[PDB]
């Protein structure tokens, strides 16, 4: 690579991903959610591109990455926003759910419930935005990293540029942690909580799928 | 809890002492050693630092949630000096072609034998794996379960195992940046043992076949 995404410092990369930051849009249930999602992943498209490295792949990579990691990211988008609601999912400003709603779909009250863990211990971890929109890019990098076909030597320089990037991701994590007063110890523990809580998008992803 | 009071060479320690023992129409000799395997992994959870801890619910939601994850890393873990090949057992060697045999078993294998490869090149180690593989059983469930002590208690066991595999990291002399870099990697492998393990749920349901419930999870607890 020749990559200036490799070449940024923390609080770079953090303004880069701040700027990047889609709006919040507004509003059957399968109808509205499904209204908003669409009109969500044309944003989600255009940060994608924005995302440092990201445009340094093939449009297959990209593509992968994208068609990985889009349920999880919508998913994160949905934590991310209903933080300061306990109990309730804040599809949008105008669209704001309880629990009991999700029951109106076949197999969404799991899901729903889930989704509502996340907020919590998001809540509980006084989870900032930089540090969100830091998970979230690792989210779209890492989901889909481990499933390109993975023979043609490009195949494999493009694992290593995203792992490089990741890495990247990782220092920006500890770097805003430091920042903000942290020890050492709180640093990795801090960012070891935030990325085990990736595992948990993953799963309810997953489900998500499986219901559908 | 004496488990939260560990130092991290003692962390290291019982789970090294802990480690359960590796033998084998197809999905009938897989299912035959996953089964027999299971009752193993209940007894290593059991000296998982934290585990016991937990309410009987807990813990056999924590292993409904886990027990596949687990048999493959460490199914992955046997694999690491058998480039191309799965070991699922001394007796049981098999390469990609033979996942073929199953319908939907292929993908899968592939996915293990990738995330084989990446354990391979990031030289993970024993002392690692098995802080990775406690790890898995004590995060994998506890999203989804008086409950709200047992969340915070395993939520320190885990801040527990993180200072290990840091500590590990810098008593093998890696740098600061090198040590959060790596953790890192490792949890974010994680991810993907999580969709591995969703994925074969997903197939094996596509292909009855009987899988181990919430009820045999807890006889088995119980036993
Ligand atoms: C399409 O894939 C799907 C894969 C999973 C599902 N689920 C519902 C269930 F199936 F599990 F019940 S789920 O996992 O619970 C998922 C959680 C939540 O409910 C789902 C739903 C949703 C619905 C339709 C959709 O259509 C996207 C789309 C775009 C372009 C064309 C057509 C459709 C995308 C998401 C939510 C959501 C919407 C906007 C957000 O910012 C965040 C969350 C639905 C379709
Ligand atoms: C049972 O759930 C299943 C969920 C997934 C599947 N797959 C096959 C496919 F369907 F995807 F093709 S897979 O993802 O490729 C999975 C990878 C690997 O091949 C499968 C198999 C296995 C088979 C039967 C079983 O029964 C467990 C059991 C125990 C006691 C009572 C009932 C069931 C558990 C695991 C492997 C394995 C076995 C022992 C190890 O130490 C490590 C790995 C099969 C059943």
């Known amino acids: 690579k020749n990559s200036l995404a ?4 923390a609080d770079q990369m953090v303004s880069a991903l701040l700027d990047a930051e889609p709006p919040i849009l507004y509003s059957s249930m399968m109808g509205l959610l499904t209204n908003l999602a669409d009109r969500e992943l044309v944003h989600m498209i255009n940060w994608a591109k ?3 490295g990201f445009v340094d792949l093939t449009s297959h990579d990209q593509v992968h990455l994208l068609e990985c990691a889009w349920l999880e990211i919508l998913m994160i988008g949905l934590v991310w926003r209903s933080m300061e609601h306990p109990g309730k999912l804040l599809f949008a400003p105008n669209l704001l759910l309880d629990r009991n709603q999700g029951k109106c779909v076949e197999g969404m009250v ?3 419930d889930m989704l509502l863990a996340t907020s919590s211990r998001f809540r509980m971890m006084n989870l900032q935005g930089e540090e969100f929109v830091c998970l979230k890019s690792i989210i779209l990098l890492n ?3 481990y499933t390109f076909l993975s023979s043609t030597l490009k195949s494999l320089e493009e694992k290593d540029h995203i ?3 990741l890495d990247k991701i990782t220092d920006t ?3 805003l942690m430091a920042k903000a007063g942290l020890t050492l110890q709180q640093q990795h523990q801090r960012l070891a909580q935030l990325l085990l809580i990736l595992s948990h998008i993953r ?3 997953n489900k998500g799928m499986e219901h559908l």
């Open 110 to 112: 799991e899901i729903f």
């Open 143 to 145: 989901s889909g990293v």
């Open 6 to 9: 490799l070449s940024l410092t």
């Open 163 to 165: 792992h490089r990037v």
């Open 50 to 52: 924005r995302v440092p």
């Open 173 to 175: 994590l500890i770097h």
């Open 203 to 205: 799963h309810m992803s």
